[PDB]
Coordinates of C-alpha atoms and ligand atoms in Angstrom, one line a residue:
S1 CA 148.1 75.9 90.0
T2 CA 147.5 72.1 89.4
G3 CA 145.3 69.9 87.5
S4 CA 144.6 66.2 87.7
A5 CA 142.2 64.3 85.4
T6 CA 141.2 60.7 84.8
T7 CA 142.0 59.1 81.4
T8 CA 140.3 56.2 80.3
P9 CA 140.8 53.7 77.5
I10 CA 138.3 53.9 74.8
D11 CA 138.1 50.1 74.5
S12 CA 139.0 46.4 75.6
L13 CA 142.5 46.9 73.8
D14 CA 143.7 50.4 75.1
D15 CA 143.6 51.4 71.5
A16 CA 143.5 55.1 73.0
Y17 CA 142.6 57.0 76.1
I18 CA 140.3 59.8 76.4
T19 CA 140.4 62.4 79.2
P20 CA 137.3 64.7 79.8
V21 CA 138.0 68.5 79.0
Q22 CA 135.9 71.4 79.9
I23 CA 135.6 73.9 77.0
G24 CA 133.7 77.4 77.1
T25 CA 131.2 79.0 79.4
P26 CA 128.8 77.3 80.4
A27 CA 131.3 74.3 80.3
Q28 CA 131.1 72.0 77.4
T29 CA 132.9 68.6 78.2
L30 CA 134.5 66.9 75.3
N31 CA 136.6 63.6 75.8
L32 CA 139.9 64.2 74.1
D33 CA 142.7 62.1 73.0
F34 CA 145.7 63.8 74.8
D35 CA 148.5 63.3 72.4
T36 CA 152.2 64.0 73.3
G37 CA 152.9 63.4 69.5
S38 CA 151.3 66.5 68.4
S39 CA 150.3 70.2 69.2
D40 CA 146.9 70.8 68.1
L41 CA 143.8 71.1 70.3
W42 CA 141.0 70.4 68.0
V43 CA 137.5 69.1 68.5
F44 CA 134.5 67.8 66.7
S45 CA 132.3 70.8 66.5
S46 CA 129.0 72.5 65.3
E47 CA 131.0 73.3 62.1
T48 CA 132.1 69.7 61.4
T49 CA 130.6 68.4 58.1
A50 CA 127.4 66.5 59.3
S51 CA 128.1 63.3 57.5
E52 CA 131.4 63.3 58.9
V53 CA 130.0 63.2 62.6
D54 CA 128.8 59.8 64.1
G55 CA 128.2 59.7 67.7
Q56 CA 130.9 62.4 68.8
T57 CA 130.2 65.1 71.4
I58 CA 130.5 68.6 69.5
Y59 CA 131.7 71.9 70.8
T60 CA 129.3 74.5 69.8
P61 CA 131.1 78.1 70.1
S62 CA 128.1 79.9 69.5
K63 CA 126.8 78.5 72.8
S64 CA 129.9 79.7 74.8
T65 CA 129.9 83.3 76.1
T66 CA 133.6 83.4 76.0
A67 CA 134.3 81.8 72.7
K68 CA 136.0 84.2 70.3
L69 CA 136.4 83.5 66.6
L70 CA 140.5 83.8 66.0
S71 CA 140.0 85.7 62.8
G72 CA 141.6 84.3 59.6
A73 CA 143.2 81.4 61.4
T74 CA 142.9 78.0 59.8
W75 CA 144.5 74.6 60.8
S76 CA 145.1 71.4 59.0
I77 CA 146.8 68.5 60.4
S78 CA 147.7 64.9 59.2
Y79 CA 148.9 62.3 61.6
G80 CA 151.2 59.4 61.2
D81 CA 148.5 56.8 60.7
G82 CA 147.2 58.8 57.6
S83 CA 144.3 60.5 59.3
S84 CA 143.6 64.0 59.2
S85 CA 141.4 66.8 60.2
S86 CA 141.1 70.6 59.4
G87 CA 139.0 73.8 60.1
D88 CA 139.2 77.2 61.8
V89 CA 139.9 78.5 65.2
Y90 CA 138.4 79.9 68.3
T91 CA 140.0 81.2 71.5
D92 CA 138.2 80.0 74.6
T93 CA 138.3 78.8 78.2
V94 CA 139.6 75.2 78.6
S95 CA 139.9 73.4 81.8
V96 CA 141.4 70.1 82.6
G97 CA 141.1 68.5 85.8
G98 CA 140.6 71.7 87.7
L99 CA 143.4 73.5 85.7
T100 CA 141.9 76.5 83.6
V101 CA 143.5 78.3 80.7
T102 CA 141.8 81.3 79.3
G103 CA 142.3 82.3 75.8
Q104 CA 143.3 78.7 74.7
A105 CA 143.3 78.1 70.9
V106 CA 140.4 75.4 70.2
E107 CA 140.6 74.3 66.7
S108 CA 137.2 73.6 65.3
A109 CA 137.0 70.8 62.8
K110 CA 135.2 71.7 59.7
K111 CA 136.5 68.2 58.0
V112 CA 137.6 65.1 59.8
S113 CA 138.9 61.8 57.9
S114 CA 137.0 58.8 58.1
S115 CA 139.1 57.0 61.1
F116 CA 138.0 60.1 63.2
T117 CA 134.3 59.8 62.2
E118 CA 134.3 55.9 62.8
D119 CA 135.6 56.6 66.4
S120 CA 132.5 57.7 68.4
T121 CA 134.4 57.8 71.6
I122 CA 137.0 60.5 70.7
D123 CA 135.7 64.1 70.5
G124 CA 139.1 65.6 69.4
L125 CA 142.8 65.7 70.4
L126 CA 144.4 67.7 72.9
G127 CA 148.1 68.1 71.8
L128 CA 151.2 68.1 74.2
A129 CA 154.1 68.1 72.1
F130 CA 156.1 71.2 71.6
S131 CA 154.1 74.3 70.3
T132 CA 156.5 74.5 67.3
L133 CA 154.4 71.8 65.6
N134 CA 151.1 73.5 66.0
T135 CA 149.4 73.8 62.7
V136 CA 147.3 77.1 63.0
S137 CA 148.1 79.5 60.3
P138 CA 149.0 82.5 59.9
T139 CA 149.7 82.7 63.7
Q140 CA 150.9 79.5 65.2
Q141 CA 149.1 78.9 68.6
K142 CA 150.4 77.3 71.8
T143 CA 149.3 74.1 73.2
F144 CA 147.2 73.8 76.7
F145 CA 150.5 72.8 78.5
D146 CA 152.5 75.8 77.3
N147 CA 149.6 78.3 77.9
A148 CA 149.3 76.9 81.5
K149 CA 152.9 76.4 82.3
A150 CA 153.3 79.8 84.1
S151 CA 150.8 79.2 86.2
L152 CA 151.7 75.7 87.2
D153 CA 153.5 74.9 90.4
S154 CA 156.0 72.9 88.6
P155 CA 156.2 73.3 84.8
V156 CA 155.4 69.5 84.3
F157 CA 152.6 67.1 83.4
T158 CA 152.8 63.4 83.9
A159 CA 151.2 60.5 82.1
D160 CA 150.0 57.5 84.0
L161 CA 148.2 55.4 81.6
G162 CA 146.3 52.2 82.6
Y163 CA 146.6 48.9 81.4
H164 CA 143.0 47.9 80.5
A165 CA 142.2 50.4 83.3
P166 CA 141.7 54.2 83.8
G167 CA 144.7 56.4 84.6
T168 CA 145.6 59.8 85.3
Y169 CA 147.2 63.0 83.7
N170 CA 148.5 65.5 86.1
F171 CA 149.7 68.9 85.5
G172 CA 151.9 71.2 87.8
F173 CA 153.1 68.0 90.1
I174 CA 154.4 64.8 90.7
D175 CA 152.3 62.4 92.7
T176 CA 154.8 60.7 94.5
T177 CA 152.3 58.1 95.4
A178 CA 151.7 57.2 91.9
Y179 CA 155.0 55.1 91.2
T180 CA 157.5 53.0 93.0
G181 CA 161.0 53.6 93.2
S182 CA 162.6 56.6 91.8
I183 CA 162.1 58.5 88.4
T184 CA 165.1 58.2 86.1
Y185 CA 165.3 61.5 84.1
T186 CA 166.6 61.6 80.4
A187 CA 167.4 64.2 78.0
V188 CA 165.1 65.4 75.4
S189 CA 165.8 67.0 72.1
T190 CA 163.1 69.4 71.1
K191 CA 164.6 69.8 67.2
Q192 CA 161.7 67.8 65.7
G193 CA 159.0 69.4 68.2
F194 CA 158.6 66.1 70.0
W195 CA 159.4 64.6 73.4
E196 CA 162.4 62.9 71.7
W197 CA 164.7 61.1 73.8
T198 CA 167.2 58.2 73.8
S199 CA 166.4 54.7 75.2
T200 CA 169.7 52.9 76.5
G201 CA 168.8 49.8 75.0
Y202 CA 166.2 46.5 75.6
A203 CA 165.7 42.9 76.7
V204 CA 163.2 40.3 75.7
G205 CA 161.8 38.4 78.5
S206 CA 164.3 37.1 80.7
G207 CA 167.1 37.6 78.2
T208 CA 170.2 39.6 78.6
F209 CA 170.1 43.3 78.2
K210 CA 171.4 44.9 75.0
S211 CA 173.1 48.2 75.4
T212 CA 172.2 50.3 72.3
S213 CA 171.0 53.7 71.8
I214 CA 167.5 54.0 70.4
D215 CA 166.4 57.3 69.5
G216 CA 162.4 57.7 69.9
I217 CA 159.7 60.0 71.0
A218 CA 157.4 59.6 74.1
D219 CA 153.8 59.6 72.3
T220 CA 150.9 58.8 74.2
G221 CA 148.6 59.6 71.0
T222 CA 150.2 56.4 69.3
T223 CA 148.9 52.9 70.5
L224 CA 151.6 50.6 69.9
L225 CA 155.5 50.3 70.5
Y226 CA 157.4 51.1 67.2
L227 CA 161.1 50.1 67.2
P228 CA 163.8 49.3 64.9
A229 CA 163.3 46.1 62.8
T230 CA 166.4 44.4 64.4
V231 CA 164.8 45.0 68.1
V232 CA 161.5 43.9 66.7
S233 CA 162.6 40.9 65.0
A234 CA 164.6 39.8 68.2
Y235 CA 161.3 40.0 70.2
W236 CA 158.9 38.3 68.0
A237 CA 161.5 35.4 67.3
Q238 CA 160.8 34.4 71.0
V239 CA 157.1 33.9 70.1
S240 CA 156.4 30.4 68.2
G241 CA 154.3 31.2 65.2
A242 CA 154.9 34.8 65.1
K243 CA 155.5 36.2 61.7
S244 CA 155.3 39.7 60.1
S245 CA 152.3 39.7 57.7
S246 CA 152.2 42.0 54.8
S247 CA 148.6 41.6 54.2
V248 CA 147.7 42.4 58.0
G249 CA 150.4 45.2 58.1
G250 CA 152.9 43.9 60.9
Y251 CA 153.7 41.1 63.1
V252 CA 151.0 38.6 64.0
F253 CA 151.2 35.7 66.4
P254 CA 149.1 33.0 67.6
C255 CA 146.5 34.0 70.0
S256 CA 147.4 30.7 72.0
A257 CA 150.9 32.2 72.7
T258 CA 152.0 33.6 76.0
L259 CA 154.2 36.6 75.1
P260 CA 157.3 37.5 76.8
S261 CA 157.9 40.8 78.3
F262 CA 159.8 43.5 76.9
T263 CA 162.3 45.7 78.8
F264 CA 163.5 49.2 77.6
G265 CA 166.4 51.4 79.1
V266 CA 166.2 54.5 80.6
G267 CA 169.6 55.7 81.2
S268 CA 170.7 53.0 83.9
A269 CA 167.1 52.3 84.9
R270 CA 164.7 49.6 83.3
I271 CA 161.1 49.7 82.3
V272 CA 159.4 46.3 82.0
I273 CA 156.5 46.0 79.6
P274 CA 154.5 42.7 80.6
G275 CA 153.8 40.3 77.7
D276 CA 150.0 40.9 78.0
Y277 CA 150.5 44.4 77.3
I278 CA 151.9 43.4 74.0
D279 CA 148.5 41.6 72.8
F280 CA 146.3 43.5 70.9
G281 CA 143.9 40.6 70.0
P282 CA 142.4 38.9 66.9
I283 CA 143.3 40.9 63.8
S284 CA 139.6 40.2 62.9
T285 CA 136.6 38.9 64.9
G286 CA 136.9 35.2 65.5
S287 CA 140.5 35.1 64.3
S288 CA 143.2 33.0 65.9
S289 CA 145.9 35.2 64.7
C290 CA 146.5 37.9 67.1
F291 CA 148.1 41.6 66.4
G292 CA 151.5 42.2 68.2
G293 CA 151.8 45.4 70.2
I294 CA 155.5 45.8 69.2
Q295 CA 156.0 46.7 65.3
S296 CA 158.5 47.8 63.2
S297 CA 159.2 51.6 62.6
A298 CA 160.8 50.8 59.6
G299 CA 159.3 53.1 57.0
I300 CA 157.9 55.6 59.9
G301 CA 161.0 57.3 59.9
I302 CA 161.1 57.3 63.7
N303 CA 160.9 55.4 66.7
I304 CA 157.6 55.7 68.8
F305 CA 157.4 54.7 72.5
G306 CA 153.4 54.8 72.2
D307 CA 150.9 53.5 74.9
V308 CA 152.3 50.0 74.9
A309 CA 155.5 51.3 76.3
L310 CA 154.3 54.4 78.4
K311 CA 151.5 52.4 80.2
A312 CA 154.2 50.4 81.8
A313 CA 155.5 53.6 83.4
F314 CA 154.9 56.6 85.3
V315 CA 155.9 59.2 82.9
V316 CA 157.1 62.9 83.6
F317 CA 157.1 65.4 80.9
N318 CA 159.5 68.1 82.3
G319 CA 158.8 71.3 80.5
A320 CA 161.3 73.4 82.2
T321 CA 163.7 75.5 80.2
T322 CA 165.5 72.5 79.3
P323 CA 162.9 69.9 78.6
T324 CA 163.6 66.4 80.2
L325 CA 161.6 63.1 80.2
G326 CA 161.4 61.1 83.6
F327 CA 160.3 57.5 83.8
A328 CA 159.4 55.4 86.9
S329 CA 158.1 51.9 87.4
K330 CA 154.7 51.5 88.9
Ligands
47A1 N1 148.4 60.8 67.3 C1 147.2 60.6 66.2 C2 146.1 60.0 67.3 O1 146.2 60.3 68.3 C3 144.9 59.6 66.7 C4 143.7 59.3 67.5 C5 142.5 58.6 67.0 C6 142.5 58.4 65.6 BR1 140.9 57.7 64.9 C7 143.6 58.7 64.8 C8 144.6 59.4 65.3

């Protein structure tokens, strides 16, 4: 089997991407944030505290003939941005772009933090990291991908995020029309439950490539590119007027600037992030200070190849017995 679904930025900045997901019988379609940095499929639901729902589409398990309460199971998750959600668990039929999994754990939110409430476009998350991170207790649950794996033509999914445009998540096959050149594969460590890999270095604009190992995770659920302070300093040093602002919470730059590209290494291959991808617009409405799309990972504890990086590539998440990541230009 295979699946193919279009993923759409939630706003003009590509702050996140939503992908339609069919849950239950008859189908209830929710727009979920596919997140290769976490491993819970959770949704706004009929059980979510009413004051914490503001515009989201909710899953109502009582209206699904295939929904079954997973007795005694609860979940609770906190994300890197400080957001959180928790609730109980159903199993139900979940379909993504024609690919169907029965008995998928669908984690029903009883509580969500303010940032989720305030984002009316995201109805939940579909986690695509390794199932070892799944927060369901006392019986850990498998991700949609893990459940689908055996049925897939090939044990892979691919992320093809658009810049200010729709893109595609495919399951079970590699679309050879979707990228240019060849896909370069690189080793993955699953030890932290992430799609963790090691970039071979970077370049800023037309500058020389710096060969240096950068261990990080491929995370579709993180907006920006978070890299070591040395790297990030070297990037923003090429932008007149750019500075790290503690009040804003990162590097900002004059909105009048033209940003240089940023290249990262994948083995001997190179992925180029155009400068425009690194512009996240005025820090506040009407401001001439713009927020940078490349930020320091200092204090995070890990480097994160978020959407800013991933949307510059066709990315293969290879879930074979020994997982790997593949990157191609496009
Ligand atoms: N990885 C965390 C994530 O995907 C996320 C998405 C939307 C909000 Br609001 C907060 C967090």
